[PDB]
Design a protein around this ligand. Structure first.
Ligand code: HEM
Ligand code: HEM
Ligand code: HEM
Ligand code: HEM
Lengths: 146, 141, 146, 141
């Protein structure tokens, strides 16, 4: 996408403080709790019946970590998200059949998680920068659908 | 909220659809799969090629449910109760897709009811499809 | 945007049969009827109280014609909608304050109007091509918002 | 549909908001204008710079309305009747923007209620804001 250098440095700085494994597990878990229809892709994962079951489910945590790790790696290529995520885009379409609306939902939950985590440090300008990034990633992941 | 005039408009239009309801249902699906390819992610188990029996069959089911909703427009939540359970707990289609199908249904009706599809009827039909969509997503959480 | 040559020729062929003035008036009128909150920009236009008043309102017809004419001219530059609509984008943001969601609503109403007009000639593949075009135009018009 | 548990969660969270409701309302607005610039098209008559009295004032009004909705969560349509008339017939804000403000309100709450903003409360709050949004857009057509 297009971030001003001050937006880019805002995103970069905050992300250096993120425990990717922890935030990943939290974001995926909250996605499954707040928007329960997203559970549709994960019934191989065990008990998802209550909020506590979802948040404590080890498969959810593991997958959350895998997703946010790929997300992390994309922050290093903000200039070319589409190229970075082309293969994953294809995979999510052809093999996993994930409606790309799910990427948008996850992006918004991730922003809530960052806000919860960082409190007042997650200022309005920083949120704005992260919104552009998550929209960009969702875009990039949806790009090769057909 | 459907006004009495909206209900009259929907019954009149759907009345003229009559026996073609199933054929129009299939056409709307095909329009949706071509115009909004993301919707195909919910049908990986179907042959989505043109004229496929699976799509025609599904189109007929969708159309019959809408027929049921028109017949019970004053009591839709009850009439569609089983269908809202099915979409909420089983199928779990993201709510945004209901809009997409609604639009394609509207286009299909427009293409087949030249005389019936007045501005006022168009408005009533869009309202009606939004209400059906609201009921079908009622129990998602 | 990106249309295959068969999509491009489908769009082009159908459009050669459109009376731009008539379809324009119809599409804008139906926008104002089906989504009445869009009337917010037009109270300078007179009586918009009933469907018949809206569809017969001469200012609505005139504006519809102006809008679809610009749309028409954009069909000639499908390869670069953003460049074609940059000035209008700016105008709609800075001076007219039109929420770009309105462009999407109009695009969908226009597709309904074409369907109503052309009946069975407006096949599923042709609709698909037009959906890409109207999304592209909405995009192009929203591009310079800030 | 808000379950009793959802209502308990919303009352608890909003309770902790208490007296800061107005300040949080303004922050949510500012977040919305920066993250989703298209929403500024509805406020051309405001000074939208940081700390502007107009935004703070408006934030307080938004917050008081939400406070009113929490107090009358069993009877929201009635409680917000004047506000739905106002948005439907006067302001005529496109319904998509309600989502955007709801998200920014959620972010604001998350940033200020570290202990309260559990997964279950998050879910209840999102549901609640969606219900408020539905009521405020009820009379648009
Ligand atoms: C930030 C956005 C996302 C990114 C970066 C991402 C990335 C990934 C990666 C790296 C994998 C592993 C691929 C492999 O094995 O080769 C994966 C798998 C998968 N993802 Fe995504 N993903 C994202 C969002 C989502 C969302 C929102 C959902 C659905 C709610 C989803 C559903 C899946 C599923 C079902 C798999 C398969 C897991 C398995 O085999 O057990 N992903 N994703
Ligand atoms: C106007 C709104 C809709 C109506 C009235 C409707 C109605 C129905 C009905 C009657 C069934 C068959 C249930 C049965 O077997 O007993 C069904 C199944 C299904 N629907 Fe919905 N539906 C609507 C919207 C959607 C949308 C928007 C999607 C996805 C884009 C969708 C995806 C499905 C799928 C995947 C099935 C299962 C098909 C199968 O496995 O055979 N539906 N729907
Ligand atoms: C296909 C999308 C659209 C295009 C191509 C378009 C194009 C135009 C053009 C060519 C003008 C005249 C500009 C000038 O005087 O220099 C205009 C004005 C205007 N448009 Fe748009 N427009 C579009 C959609 C919309 C929508 C959906 C709305 C709101 C519902 C809207 C509201 C306005 C308004 C209020 C004016 C000012 C009219 C006046 O001064 O009386 N337009 N537009
Ligand atoms: C949670 C949903 C919202 C609530 C509870 C809410 C509440 C209110 C209230 C209490 C007022 C003041 C009414 C008065 O003066 O008596 C108002 C005005 C207004 N609202 Fe809404 N609102 C909401 C969403 C929105 C959204 C999403 C937008 C646009 C992005 C919006 C735009 C406006 C505008 C333009 C005014 C007029 C401000 C002025 O001229 O001073 N509202 N709202």
């Amino acid at each position: 996408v297009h971030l001003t250098p001050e937006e880019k440095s805002a995103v970069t700085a905050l992300w250096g403080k993120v425990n990717v494994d922890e935030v990943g597990g939290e974001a995926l878990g909250r996605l499954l709790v707040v928007y329960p229809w997203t559970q549709r892709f994960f019934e191989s994962f065990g008990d998802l019946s209550t909020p506590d079951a979802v948040m404590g489910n080890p498969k959810v945590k593991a997958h959350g970590k895998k997703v946010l790790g790929a997300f992390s790696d994309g922050l290093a290529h903000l200039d070319n998200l589409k190229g970075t995520f082309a293969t994953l885009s294809e995979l999510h379409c052809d093999k996993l059949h994930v409606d790309p609306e799910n990427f948008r939902l996850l992006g918004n939950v991730l922003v809530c998680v960052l806000a919860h985590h960082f409190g007042k440090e997650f200022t309005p300008p920083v949120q704005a920068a992260y919104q552009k990034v998550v929209a960009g990633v969702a875009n990039a992941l949806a790009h090769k659908y057909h | 909220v459907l006004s009495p005039a909206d209900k009259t408009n929907v019954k009149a239009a759907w009345g003229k659809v009559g026996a073609h309801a199933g054929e129009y249902g299939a056409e709307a699906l095909e329009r949706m799969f071509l115009s909004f390819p993301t919707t195909k992610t919910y049908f990986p188990h179907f042959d989505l090629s043109h004229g496929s029996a699976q799509v025609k069959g599904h189109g007929k089911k969708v159309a019959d449910a809408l027929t049921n909703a028109v017949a019970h427009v004053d009591d839709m939540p009850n009439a569609l109760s089983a269908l809202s359970d099915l979409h909420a707990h089983k199928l779990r289609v993201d709510p945004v897709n209901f809009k997409l199908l609604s639009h394609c249904l509207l286009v299909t009706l427009a293409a087949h009811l030249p005389a019936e599809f007045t501005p006022a009827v168009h408005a009533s039909l869009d309202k009606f499809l939004a209400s059906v969509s609201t009921v079908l997503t009622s129990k998602y959480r």
